[PDB]
Write a protein that binds this ligand. Structure first.
Ligand code: MG
Ligand code: ZN
Lengths: 48, 58, 722, 695, 226, 230
């Protein structure tokens, strides 16, 4: 998700489809795409 | 012209040429396009003074 | 200018629109309406009770102000909203550097957090009172500036050229001093002996000259007397009572030091109060400073005439010797550029000499309010040589300041550089934006997840180098490099612990260690951090923005990217003129920063010796070459080099494992290959800081180290079948 | 706008394709394209402006005039040369010293030679000379007095922003200006001129009737409060009385921003350069409340609200006064034909034009048909589409125009009636507006002081505006101080006849030695007033009370503190400067939103002010909130404040009723993203660790 | 120490210009008091002005009246600078009527009983040979300045045009502080407040009103405490 | 229109805060500076105009038997508060012997003169005291710098000192806007005034009010006009 968001969306998504590689929610960018509390600041599970 | 309001000028040298019409670039060109009477007058006037002019309207 | 640091005045219609649903709820609850739809109708009608209810409701609802280009976290800040008339948003005068917002038609956007958590975070984390220190270097950003500093400088300046009155008199208090000032028989800046009562803390410098007496005088907490000036006695009433007295011109840099000390020593509320008091005093005394630009206050030095005439005569001689045919046109040019550079610098120094220090422009420049000395040179003495078309240097300069009046051709020549600079800025905005985007995408998700990894490794940073004449002096860049970085382990030089382990490395430790003679220090760092979960707080150090220890969950990567991206627009490093040079001139400025950060091979690449050896030249007319054969029974190596190489290593000489051969920019790949990993880290950090601190921009080395750590996280594998 | 030389367009360059050498002034631009006037954005160097003396050749090249310097003696024989024929000649300067005989005086005559190479020559060698020392400059930049005392950056900014000046109710030409307002206004088209000689006959405000000397009559009809493309007014005012002998070309009425046929884009204000309690800090501006009372910087702005009556499938739309189900007061101010009455004052929500849809297929299902049949009252199903004032606007209805299909008025296919209502408003200068001068010295308005609070001179006159002196040297435009000094000098006229001093000698040989108070002065952009003359004249400024000359030869005057009364410690620099009111108006910029029009594909707030749009919270701001660690705020404003239909509805419901804001959900942008890349044939399934995670 | 109580005089230089001298003042005390007088004079001394107008056959201010060389907006610019003194608490209407050619000035106005126009040379418009003007000027007395927006209170008369009322009757006030010749260790000072006023009042009445205002304001502080 | 009112808050016995509640725009800056200058430079009181220490000279720096320099003695004395009802340059005596400290409690006031701060320390005596000093109290108002008063000329020991006749030592004013019935240009005035031990702050405020009321009744009596009030 983060790599597709940054650059080379076609190449990144094609490689991800070939590899059948899944994305885990962990990350900042890829957690603002889905619209979730970022894993930083006060959004950490400790503070949640 | 001579009827302009009063304004006191500090110019120390005299320009022998006054600024031409500030819209000649458009009106003259479009007169050449339509080739109307103003453009013909301009053409004959330029020919009398031996200038370079477009003799064929747009 | 009447706002507190945590206050914003927002227009009436804007506040009405943003807070609509709350206004309807309050109107219904206060029985001003029987139903929500009627409340909506009346709110649309703009009744008076609606306005009173808006005043009631905006309280205790923090409001996030923002400017369009958000170059760092102090570009969106939370304020407490107060309801104001007009059609414009009222903002504090000294938060204009955090936003970069000058009042020339700039605009501000504004947002309203809704949830309890959202506004709680707004007030606790984002409030303008808390955000006083920049994250890039730790220097305070919300501090007085421009007219405010010109006012405190007038307050605490000397009496030179200020025709003092009542100098040498003695006063039993400052109240008596202001009585004399009102009477017209004392000046705010006249040397006078003032008595200060119990509670006043004397100057740190003046204490050892305490009053002689058999009894032990409580210099900390006793009445004392000081040969001060009235303005300084007034200035020291703005600072908190416990603060030591200040007895010097607080122009711009000393005010920055005082604000930094206040922030690092006193709690945030008192620091904000002190900032407000300093703001009020600075404005108040800036009004009466007497700084008013007039055509006479721009003083053209009488030196300029004769200097420019004599150098003009020399130019005439050079032109005559060109037209006679002895020299070429290029020689004539270079000679005239040298002549007129001499003339320009001579006129600049004469202009600096001429004006008094009580001049308006001199006051605002020397106070560090607004201005430089080149600007004054152009305005008063001389404009000088300018970038000709196609990035060249006009031989003939502009021999006239703006006060004297540029000629026609002088103005036509001068507009070249203006246009070029405007276009350069327009492009560099987007260039820096792209650079910051890449830095953020790389460094994002490097988050402090660990309180403390139990490492004992660190960097061997020079603590007090520069032993020029055998004198231990604090290094010139401890502020960026070694400051804020904690200590790996206890440092002992005399058999006792000078600095305990893992403690914040502030200036007091620096003075201790430089006095005791050390020349290095072992600091914990992210580069040497070994933690299971990403980075740890202790190795990173202290957050340059909050001052305290880095809190777990800090998005340090985004902070580092923003810190490196902020000054990107203002670098402005590129060749003024072509100078008939290519290749030798490596890329300068933001191009250089992208070159280092992308790992792209430098444009002016120069090979670096693989091993210590004997190096000689095997130059061939078809192709020049430099060949080094190493000792210790090693294989020889060679480098193809251009004819124009300006070699910095002689033939048949002894090179070492990690030395350059020709003048240029070493590849980071080489420094990683032949030297090692600490070497490439050091080289990259130093090379980026080179341009950054050549401009004067100051970024802590941690923010670069984050990117460098991300750049070296992967290894290319070989012999991998097993 | 009519002298531009555009480059970005069809058959030419583009924004990104253009490099540098096109965006940079060339040595051949001298006299043909303006170095200084240029956009301050992406279009730098692309969009330009013809010089004052430029002439487009038949082939399309620009030509500039040059006096033929024949064997070193100047002549009036002007030849127009283009850049290519210009690069074969040696060109002197118009300001080169010259004697009574036209032969050159000094041996060294500076010349602009081929390749942009200035290099002096003997003089007989010289072959051409510039016809004017402002040949290089354009018209707008020629407005600026003391241009040579400004860096090109601020001259460029000033020329750019002089074009945004709003026209004011009463317009006065600048007290200190160039010799260029008259010709600039006359050669434009807003100044009513005389076609032929004659005598004026009837002079109302609306028309001027003149009896020609050839035996004919002409009645010039004058425009009165006519809206412009940008919403200003084109009111015209007469200059002649009903006995005046006219000549062809003479000005009979003046257009907006003109006085006696001379441009007047702003007003002369009395300014003192000083800091003032941190209100003109960082380029802000302080001005007295006099300018609000006197309406010195006021303007009239007109807004049109056009509405059309259509013919839908269910019938025709009609402009009917009897709007369905409304109170009597809302349409009490509506004509019998449904349109608002001229002269009425309007506020947000006022029905400018009443219109009704023929009917709405809202509830006519068999159930509703049975209900209506049993009721016996066929409830009207018409939609109230009445034109209303956009929220945030006020004014008086200055006009109404109605086009119709039944009459001969043409209309586009589909519309039966077209009603265009013009609503006019008067804008007084308030805190938020933007003033500027002719030197790029612009700033917003921060405070309006009571007339007593403002500093005042010795005899009591307050100053009008307060400007920070910090900007002048740092921004490096020390021409506004010269303008200020000459403005004060002109307001308090001088009498320097017969002093036998150099500056006085020059001023009396020119003919400016004696000048009555209030006279307007001309400062040619490269032949203007000298600094020495300004200083000398300042010593001989006609006094007011006895010999009172508030301003000393230092250019400075002693002021008093209007809030305490004590004299200020040192003299201040005061004088008259021309301040322009720019079209950047605070009223338009104020943009606010709570809820409103979302977009179609992405369920996000729309942009633009007229749409009541939202504010683009770019990704840089997301970085800022992430750096702060503000987790819940970012989640709330990425989902609840945008792109979460259920969240958007429920947050509003909770606030109006009073309740906790609900937990966010899945953005609709994510849903459309996954559907899009599914249509790209990627099996993008939101998976849980135990299966398929909730969409 | 010095028992000289302050004393006030009046010099007269023109019919509406007067210098008022206060000699027995402490040093460094003339400026503050003179500026308090200047502030109160320029701020809060009552006068009167035209609150509104109404021309025949005119519904708004953005139109023209036939035969008149000036627009209604220019007419209002001329009306707002009318120096008129009233004596009625309630508004009193004031009519102007003119026909045929002629510069309609302020002298042509027909003020009611208890109202006066103190500038008869004010040129209000210039009619044509076929121009007629019929105006209904409402005069009201207040202090300071009130905008046309605040003067707006009724709408049933579609034809009225509320205008801005410059109530202030004083024109410009300055002052000075000189040195009293008295030989003293403190060198007392002499205040010279120079008042010029519009024709509605003499400077003496403006000074009296300013003094009354200030006396009341400071008697608040004096009497209220103990 | 609105009736401004005066309220006072007492922080201690030496200074107090005075708040002037809603007034019209710009009236805050009419009341503020005038009240400040009147409170400061109009109220009458007594101060020590000169001092003669036994066997001393004006140029002679210190005093034998006294550790404090002459300048320190001058400061300690011009800090002294005294109230003189005699309307003449009375002279007050202070006699001290032996070592110790000499306070203002040991002054010898004539009938009518009084020193209100008895615990002020004038000097410290080492060894033999022999401190006999006569100081010339005087009456006045304001602040007079120690211009040559011919006090050294009459007798060398008698030296001139700066005189703080004014009971109020310092006072500062500030004008801050207040929200008063939908209007936001109404001002309120804050005056913080400190005063020596002579009189309370409220008494000084009342005296300044009296002085200003008379000073502007002067102008009010030019004619019985009626600007209006409350
Ligand atoms: Mg700006
Ligand atoms: Zn670690």
């Amino acid at each position: 998700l983060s790599a597709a968001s940054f650059q080379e969306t076609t190449r990144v998504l094609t490689d991800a489809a070939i590899n059948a590689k899944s994305d885990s929610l962990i990350g900042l960018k890829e957690n603002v795409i889905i619209g979730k509390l970022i894993p930083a600041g006060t959004g950490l599970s400790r503070y949640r | 012209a001579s009827t302009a309001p009063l304004r006191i000028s500090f110019a120390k040298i005299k320009e022998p040429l006054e600024v031409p019409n500030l819209l000649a670039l458009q009106t003259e060109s479009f007169d050449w396009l339509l080739g109307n009477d103003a453009w013909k007058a301009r053409v004959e006037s330029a020919l009398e003074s031996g200038q370079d002019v477009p003799t064929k309207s747009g | 200018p009447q706002l507190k640091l945590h206050q914003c005045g927002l227009p009436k219609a804007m506040a009405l629109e943003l807070f609509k649903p709350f206004v309807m709820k309050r109107l219904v609850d206060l029985n001003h309406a029987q139903n929500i739809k009627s409340a909506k109708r009346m709110v649309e009608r703009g009744r008076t009770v609606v306005y009173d209810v808006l005043e009631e409701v905006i309280a205790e609802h923090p409001v996030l102000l923002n400017r369009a280009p958000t170059l760092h976290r102090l570009g969106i800040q939370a304020f407490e909203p107060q309801l104001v008339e007009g059609k414009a948003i009222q903002i504090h005068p000294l938060v204009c550097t955090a936003f970069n917002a000058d009042f020339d038609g700039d605009q501000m956007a504004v947002h309203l957090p809704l949830s309890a958590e959202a506004q709680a975070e707004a007030r606790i984390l984002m409030l303008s009172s808390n955000n006083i220190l920049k994250p890039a270097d730790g220097r305070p950003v919300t501090m007085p500036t421009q007219d405010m500093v010109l006012g405190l400088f007038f307050l605490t300046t000397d009496s030179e050229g200020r025709s003092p009155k009542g100098e040498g008199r003695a006063f039993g208090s400052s109240a008596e001093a202001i009585m004399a000032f009102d009477a017209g028989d004392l000046t705010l800046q006249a040397k006078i002996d003032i008595r200060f009562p119990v509670g006043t803390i004397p100057p740190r410098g003046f204490e050892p000259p305490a009053r002689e007496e058999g009894e032990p005088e409580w210099q900390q907490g006793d009445t004392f007397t000081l040969k001060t000036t009235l303005g300084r006695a007034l200035f020291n009433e703005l600072l908190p009572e416990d603060y030591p007295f200040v007895d010097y011109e607080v122009g711009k840099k000393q005010l920055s030091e005082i604000v930094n000390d206040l922030a690092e020593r006193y709690p945030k509320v008192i620091v904000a109060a002190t900032l407000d008091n300093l703001k009020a005093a600075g404005f108040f005394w800036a009004t009466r400073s007497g700084v008013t630009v007039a055509i006479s206050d721009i003083v053209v030095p009488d030196a300029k005439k004769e200097i420019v005439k004599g150098y003009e005569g020399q130019d005439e001689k050079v032109q005559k010797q060109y037209e006679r045919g002895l020299i070429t046109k290029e020689e004539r040019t270079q000679e005239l550029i040298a002549i007129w550079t001499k003339a320009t610098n001579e006129v600049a120094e004469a202009m600096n000499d001429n004006f008094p220090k009580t001049n308006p422009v001199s006051m605002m420049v020397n106070s560090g309010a607004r201005g430089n000395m080149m600007q004054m040179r152009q305005i008063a003495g001389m404009r000088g040589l300018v970038s000709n078309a196609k990035n060249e240097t006009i031989p003939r300069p502009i021999k006239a300041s703006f006060r004297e009046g540029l000629s026609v051709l002088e103005y036509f020549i001068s507009t070249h550089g203006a246009r070029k600079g405007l276009a350069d800025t327009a492009l560099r905005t987007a260039d820096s934006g792209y650079l910051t985007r890449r830095l953020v995408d790389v460094s994002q998700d490097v988050i402090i997840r660990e309180e403390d990894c139990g490492t004992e490794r660190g960097l061997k940073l020079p603590i007090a180098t520069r032993d020029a004449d055998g004198t231990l002096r604090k290094a010139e860049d401890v502020e960026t490099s070694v400051y804020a970085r904690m200590l790996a382990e206890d440092v002992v030089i005399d058999g006792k612990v000078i600095a305990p382990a893992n403690v914040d490395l502030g200036d007091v430790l620096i003075d201790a260690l430089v006095a005791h003679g050390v020349e290095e220090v072992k600091t914990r760092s992210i580069l040497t951090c070994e933690s299971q979960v990403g980075t740890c707080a202790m190795c990173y150090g202290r957050s340059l923005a909050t001052g305290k220890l880095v809190d777990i969950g800090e998005a340090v990567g985004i902070i580092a990217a923003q810190s490196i991206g902020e000054p990107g627009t203002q670098l402005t490093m590129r060749t003024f003129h072509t100078g008939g040079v290519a290749g030798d001139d490596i890329t300068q400025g933001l191009p250089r920063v992208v070159e280092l950060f992308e790992a792209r091979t430098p444009k002016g690449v120069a090979p670096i010796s693989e091993a210590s050896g004997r190096v000689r030249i095997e130059e061939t007319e078809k192709t020049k070459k430099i060949v080094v054969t190493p000792d210790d029974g090693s294989d020889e190596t060679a480098f193809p080099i251009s004819k124009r190489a300006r070699l910095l290593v002689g033939e048949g000489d002894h090179v070492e494992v990690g030395q350059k051969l020709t003048v240029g920019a070493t590849n980071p790949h080489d420094v990683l290959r032949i030297l090692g990993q600490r070497a490439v880290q050091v080289h990259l950090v130093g090379e980026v800081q080179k341009v950054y601190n050549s401009q004067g921009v100051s970024i802590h080395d941690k923010h670069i180290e984050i990117i460098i750590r991300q750049m070296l996280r992967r290894v290319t594998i070989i012999e991998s079948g097993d | 706008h009519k002298r531009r030389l555009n480059a970005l367009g069809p058959g030419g360059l583009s924004r990104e394709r253009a490099g540098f050498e096109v965006r940079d002034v060339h040595p051949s631009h001298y006299g043909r394209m303006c170095p200084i006037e240029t956009p301050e954005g992406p279009n730098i160097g692309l969009i330009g402006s013809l010089a004052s003396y430029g002439r487009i050749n038949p082939f399309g090249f620009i030509e500039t005039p040059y006096r033929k310097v024949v064997e070193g003696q100047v002549t009036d024989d002007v030849d127009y040369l283009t850049a290519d024929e210009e690069d074969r000649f040696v060109i002197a300067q118009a300001n080169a010293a010259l004697g009574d005989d036209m032969r050159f005086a000094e041996a060294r005559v500076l010349v602009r030679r081929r390749g942009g190479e200035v290099d002096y020559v003997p003089g007989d060698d010289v072959d051409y000379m510039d016809v004017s020392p402002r040949q290089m400059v354009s018209v707008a930049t020629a407005m600026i007095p003391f241009l040579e005392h400004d860096d090109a950056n601020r001259a460029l900014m000033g020329a750019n922003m002089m074009r945004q000046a709003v026209p004011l109710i009463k317009s006065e030409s600048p007290l200190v200006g160039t010799g260029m307002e008259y010709r600039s206004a006359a050669d434009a088209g807003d100044v009513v001129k005389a076609e032929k000689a004659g005598v004026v006959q009837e002079v109302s405000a609306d028309y001027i009737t003149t009896t020609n000397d050839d035996g004919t009559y002409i009645t010039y009809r004058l425009a009165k409060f006519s809206r412009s493309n940008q919403g200003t007014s084109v009111n015209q005012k007469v200059i002649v009385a009903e006995g005046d002998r006219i000549i062809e070309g003479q000005v009979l009425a003046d257009g907006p921003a003109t006085e006696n046929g001379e441009m007047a884009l702003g007003k002369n204000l009395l300014v003192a350069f000083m800091p003032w309690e941190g209100h003109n800090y960082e380029d802000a501006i302080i001005l007295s409340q006099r300018l609000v009372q006197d309406d010195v910087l006021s303007s009239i702005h007109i807004e049109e609200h056009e509405v059309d009556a259509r013919d839908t499938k269910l019938g025709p739309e009609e402009i009917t006064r009897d709007i369905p189900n409304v109170s009597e007061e809302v349409l009490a101010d509506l004509d019998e034909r449904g349109i608002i009455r001229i002269g009425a004052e309007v506020v947000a929500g006022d029905i400018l034009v009443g219109k009704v849809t023929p009917k709405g297929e809202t509830e006519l299902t068999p159930e509703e048909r049975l209900l209506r049949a049993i009721f016996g009252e066929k409830a009207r199903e018409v939609r109230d589409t009445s034109l209303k004032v956009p929220h945030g606007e006020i004014g008086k209805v200055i006009g109404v125009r109605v086009f119709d299909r039944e009459e001969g008025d043409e209309l586009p296919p589909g519309v039966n009636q077209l009603v265009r209502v013009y609503v006019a408003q008067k804008r007084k200068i308030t805190d938020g507006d933007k003033l500027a001068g002719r030197h790029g010295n612009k700033g917003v308005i921060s405070k309006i002081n009571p007339i007593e609070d403002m500093p005042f001179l010795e005899d009591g006159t307050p100053v009008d505006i307060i400007l920070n002196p910090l900007a002048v040297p740092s921004r490096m435009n020390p021409g506004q101080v010269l303008e200020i000094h000459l403005g004060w000098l002109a307001s308090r006229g001088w009498d320097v006849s017969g002093l036998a001093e150099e500056w006085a000698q020059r001023l009396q040989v020119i003919g400016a030695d004696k000048v009555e108070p209030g006279t307007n002065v001309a400062t040619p952009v490269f032949d203007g007033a000298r600094e020495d003359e300004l200083a000398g004249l300042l010593q001989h400024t006609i006094p007011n009370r006895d010999g009172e000359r508030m301003v000393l030869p230092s250019g400075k005057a002693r002021l008093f503190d209007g809030r305490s009364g004590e004299p200020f410690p040192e003299p201040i620099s005061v004088g008259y400067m021309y301040i322009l009111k720019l079209h950047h108006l605070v009223d338009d910029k104020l943009h606010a939103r709570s809820t409103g029009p979302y977009s179609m594909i992405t369920q996000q707030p729309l942009g633009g002010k007229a749409q009541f749009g939202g504010q683009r919270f770019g990704e840089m701001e997301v970085w800022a909130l992430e750096a702060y660690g503000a987790a819940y705020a970012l989640q709330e404003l990425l989902t609840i404040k945008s792109d979460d239909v259920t969240g958007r509805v429920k947050v509003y419901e909770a606030i109006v009723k009073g309740e906790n804001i609900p937990e966010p959900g899945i953005p609709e942008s994510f849903k459309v993203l996954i559907k899009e890349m599914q249509s790209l044939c990627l099996n993008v399934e939101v998976l849980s660790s135990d299966g398929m995670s909730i969409e | 120490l010095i028992a000289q109580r302050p004393s006030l005089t009046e010099e007269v230089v023109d019919e509406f210009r007067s210098r008022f001298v206060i000699e027995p003042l402490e040093p460094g005390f003339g400026y503050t008091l003179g500026n308090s007088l200047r502030r109160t004079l320029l701020s809060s001394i009552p006068g009167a002005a035209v609150t509104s107008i109404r021309i025949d056959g005119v519904l708004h201010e953005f139109t023209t009246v036939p035969g008149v060389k000036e627009d209604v907006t220019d007419l209002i610019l001329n009306i707002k600078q009318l120096v008129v003194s009233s004596e009625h608490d309630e508004p009193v209407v004031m009519y102007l009527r003119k026909q045929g050619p002629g510069l309609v000035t302020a002298a042509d106005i027909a003020p009611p009983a208890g109202v006066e126009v103190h500038n008869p040379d004010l040129v209000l418009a210039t009619l044509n040979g076929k121009g007629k003007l019929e105006m209904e000027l409402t005069v009201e007395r207040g202090r300071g300045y009130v905008s046309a927006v605040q003067n707006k209170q009724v709408g049933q008369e579609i034809g009225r045009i509320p205008v801005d009322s410059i109530y202030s009757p004083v024109l410009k006030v300055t002052y000075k502080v000189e040195a009293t010749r008295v030989e003293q260790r403190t060198d007392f000072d002499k205040l010279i407040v120079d008042v010029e006023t519009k024709q509605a009042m003499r400077p003496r009445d403006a000074m009296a009103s300013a003094g009354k205002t200030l006396v009341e304001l400071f008697g608040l502080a004096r009497e209220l405490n103990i």
